[PDB]
Amino acid sequence: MREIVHIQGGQCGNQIGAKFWEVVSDEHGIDPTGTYHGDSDLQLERINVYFNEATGGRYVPRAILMDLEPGTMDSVRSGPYGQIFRPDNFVFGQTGAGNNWAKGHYTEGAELIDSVLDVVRKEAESCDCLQGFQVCHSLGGGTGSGMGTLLISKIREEYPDRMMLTFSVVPSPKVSDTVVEPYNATLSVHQLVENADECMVLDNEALYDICFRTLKLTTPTFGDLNHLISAVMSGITCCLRFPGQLNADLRKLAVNLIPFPRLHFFMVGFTPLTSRGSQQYRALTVPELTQQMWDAKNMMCAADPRHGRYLTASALFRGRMSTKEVDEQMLNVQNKNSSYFVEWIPNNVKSSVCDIPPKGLKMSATFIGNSTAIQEMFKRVSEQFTAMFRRKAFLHWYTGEGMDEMEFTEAESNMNDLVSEYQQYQDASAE
Amino acid sequence: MREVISIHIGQAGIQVGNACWELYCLEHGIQPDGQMPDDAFNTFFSETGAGKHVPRCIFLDLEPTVVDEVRTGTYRQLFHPEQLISGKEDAANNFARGHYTIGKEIVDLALDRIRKLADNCTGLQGFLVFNAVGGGTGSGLGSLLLERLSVDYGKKSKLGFTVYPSPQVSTAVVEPYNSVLSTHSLLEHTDVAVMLDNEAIYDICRRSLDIERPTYTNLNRLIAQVISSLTASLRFDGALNVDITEFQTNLVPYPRIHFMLSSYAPIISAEKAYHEQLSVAEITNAAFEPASMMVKCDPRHGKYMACCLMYRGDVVPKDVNASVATIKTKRTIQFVDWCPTGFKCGINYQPPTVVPGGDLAKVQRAVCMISNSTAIGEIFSRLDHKFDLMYAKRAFVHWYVGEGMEEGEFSEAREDLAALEKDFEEVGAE
Amino acid sequence: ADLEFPAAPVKMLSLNKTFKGHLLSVANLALHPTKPILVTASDDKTWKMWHMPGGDLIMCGEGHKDWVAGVDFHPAGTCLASGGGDSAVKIWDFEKQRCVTTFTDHKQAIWSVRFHHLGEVVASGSLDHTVRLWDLPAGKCRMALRGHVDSVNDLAWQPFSSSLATASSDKTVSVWDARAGLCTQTYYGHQNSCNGVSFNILGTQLASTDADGVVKLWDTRMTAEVATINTGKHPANKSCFDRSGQVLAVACDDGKVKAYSTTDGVLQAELAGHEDAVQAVLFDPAGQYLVSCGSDNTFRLWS
Amino acid sequence: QEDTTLFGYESPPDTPALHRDVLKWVQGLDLSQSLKNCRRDVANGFLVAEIFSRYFPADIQMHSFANAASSHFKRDNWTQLQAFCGRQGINLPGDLVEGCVQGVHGAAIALLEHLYEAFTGKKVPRLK
């Protein structure tokens, strides 16, 4: 009865959202035709968080897909679970943004944004009570980053009190896809800092590392990365949808994770990720889950937590488990690694337990870490943005869309202030 | 929805258009009669109620022979007869003849047909202008057409696949003259200009295809494969789709700097095919090899500013990422200090179709690398002395003056090419 | 502390002549702590340093792209900080007569600029809703105070304290800590945009103006609304306390510099020299005279 | 012909950041939105509608105006505002309106200046 409005933006966001909705329908026993085939009462108990019952037995996702080009949405509709989405929730333009945040935020995103807000408001008023909105998209792309930031600003204006969660795919450190990724990321982070209440940073290169080293896959397509992202996206809200021994909703996670309003960027990870070869070799225990959880290799962020200091960390476990086991494990983690945890917070862990593990896994756990390590990621993005902006390369493409040069430097200043805050609380001393 | 209007001006434009449209017909399954036994063809073909597909192309030339060859050959039931526009008198390698006297009525009719074509397109990604810098028809009429298109259509992205004269080898004598004139014209109208050199493509054919007698058909087939790889992301779905509009955003740092080197890989005959692994890293290296450049311009002299890679076939993002990381770590490949990323990778799930009758082998992977690099100023440097050497004596200048030009036009073109040289030097410098 | 400087005379009229040395209206005033020298920050893109007893134009600093809204002196008068509508905070040196440095992290008009009591950090409050601290040795914005949903119209360091009170156009007056970067206190009560804010020399009281003319006085220690002076309908602009005195001099858009008693909120003097409006007022460090600048393109000396 | 562009890139012109009198008048007027950036804040036309309502509450209402980024809604707001201005006698020049909706540099500044003239008792902001 606490509803969540899902939004997908851009090609990457739409692919991630399609994978996520496939995973959630699998969890709730919903076939691609919408009918329930789960044979479990708890699956239908809280289905209204994500789905709405149609006239018949069909359940439609409370999902809204936005894009400037129709190809990605055509692929999503033709995918295996493409028919569950209501066709009216596919809001697409005709000319895509050429990796241009200006095109997706000011020129071309402006006309489609009112249709998008019409759909969002229609979905929101249908909700009895609204937990908030979750927007999945990629920083470093035109329509995704631009229209996502624009929509987030609009939704923040309309519903300031409602929760806002973002799954942003930050451009990767080493191998960058497009040239203008630093520009788009710089312009998007400035919006997310001011608007998004909760932000989860994902890096495709961290995803490749985790799927090459833990999963040990040989040919990881984008589908596998979207699968891991979908696993985290489900596990963050499974405490809403399923009974929990110690349940914790999105707002509780935000309250326990965010010390100060601007420090709301988080790195996430999912456990247990096991290679098909080592599945029988590994033993499923709470200590094993915690061990993989706190491994820096498990973080789906490029930045590693070792360099920074953990301000806070939430751990949402799933499965029939011992609260004594979980609490003792998190206490031992904090005591062993006290150097990596902030001193002026007596307990840096928000432990939550859900009684329903994901399908196939006896146990699972998602980790949400607010640590000053994200500082180095923003610093790298700024190191690219400044190099490009000094000579104003490709700046004419953003200028021709009618955005001030001062806007770039304002976004850079906001990023630098955020980095400064993270460093301040990294090296803050008690008393 | 993703329509692109193809223009082929002059003999070279039409002869590369023949290869391009044969390749498109083979790729989309369209028989030469016009119809094939969805909507991936809409970029290049418009379907009628009868089911027969007509290309959205325009064959423009002031000479009747080349166009009549198309009208008589196999693709006579494919193309639109009025879209094939034929002149009466050739431009005779005279830019003035093709731009001031003969080209007027022809370009008026060309704009008429271009309006008729664009009226049938819901969307319009842009224009693909295929001409020959170095001939009166291609240079003069093409320049006039590009100017008219810029005036009327406005911001539509015009991609000009131009063929400049080779450094040493050439077929004309007034080629520096009309090349300088047309370069002056197209510096300010085309959005992304792709350089092509006959000498470089001849070298590619001789070294990679082992063709001791390369010819214009082989050159056109290579160019057609390159343009097909360029447009593959418009017609076939794949991870990391790249668009005509995204070319300019990820490749053009500044409006004057939009000339691009093009390199295809692999270029292997079937006898040499399946004799090497042809992995993604190896094809990327081959694409970045200077010999694989289709312009006689060593990239070692300059520095790369941007590189858009278009992968076709069984290509995985992990492999494109590993190859691009190796390229970045590579020392001989040098990038400008102000572009840290400098890479635009885009993959497509459609392997390059092989033209029966061609020399290219059926390879499951392909790369088309289109790069903005400051080395390209070297070719303009060559033409800038090839021009002034003749201009000192005003040789052949009476020919150009006779059709209503002035010494001021030559002076302005030379000055603008010098300014382009200076701009390339300035972007290369820190 | 424990030093009483009696400043009773407020009804005295203008003593010196009305110095009209600026082409356009003067926006702010800054008095040198050591010497009786006043920098007037006018909206003519220039500031002018004058020796007031002589009325002589000692210096004229120019270079701001837009109108200059705020000006302040460094302790010991080493440098001058000028914030203007060009969104650039400029530090100028008197000795070499040029701008030492420019900070452009602010992207909107700089409403107010103030120094620390020690002077190494400079607080700039701007239209961009933020209050940015600049470490002059570092030349970098170390910290930024956020939390105002409307324009930060004024900015005043608490005397000899890291606390900083900013009156914003969101009808709020927020006192922050520079060292922590947090909002210790937020005074509500204003029904209009807060044009200006000022501290008592002892720091016990804080007075903020409104656009409807209401000047509200709070006790900083008590965090309570002590007084609510209701002036005319015109905006109350900027205010200044009497040094160890019970008289707050408030400017106005009525052209009259009023002087209300902090004890009772009763008018004591109403100087009517300015024709149209008064942008700001300032007391002498010794307490000998007031200086009032306004839309009359003239800064006038009183008492 | 000596050009100032950096290889064809003409940097956008720098705005004069309105005026203190106009900005303080706007701030003193009770408005829901704040003029952080004049271009973006005025292009939609909602803040101008709020100003017009504060000066003529009877015939300008907020329910008719929508804070919407689409060109359709911006045109709707500005055209109803223009119709009211025509009825009332206020200028509201069309060129400034079009520059404001298109985000042209300085058009919103000029329109706000003209509104300040028309409303604040024809008080011309002093300038050199």
Ligand SMILES: Nc1nc2c(ncn2[C@@H]2O[C@H](COP(=O)(O)OP(=O)(O)OP(=O)(O)O)[C@@H](O)[C@H]2O)c(=O)[nH]1
């Ligand atoms: N790469 C390539 N270049 C060609 C081909 N055919 C012609 N060219 C080039 O095109 C140039 C002249 O082309 P055109 O201007 O169209 O010749 P035309 O049709 O007789 O027109 P004019 O010569 O100007 O009167 C020559 O310098 C050749 O280098 C070709 O098949 N492939």
Ligand SMILES: Nc1nc2c(ncn2[C@@H]2O[C@H](COP(=O)(O)OP(=O)(O)O)[C@@H](O)[C@H]2O)c(=O)[nH]1
């Ligand atoms: N994890 C994941 N990342 C993707 C996918 N598709 C694209 N990306 C990445 O997302 C980044 C941004 O692209 P995107 O926002 O989708 O392009 P846009 O839709 O035009 O804005 C690119 O650099 C890609 O590397 C996907 O399916 N999964």
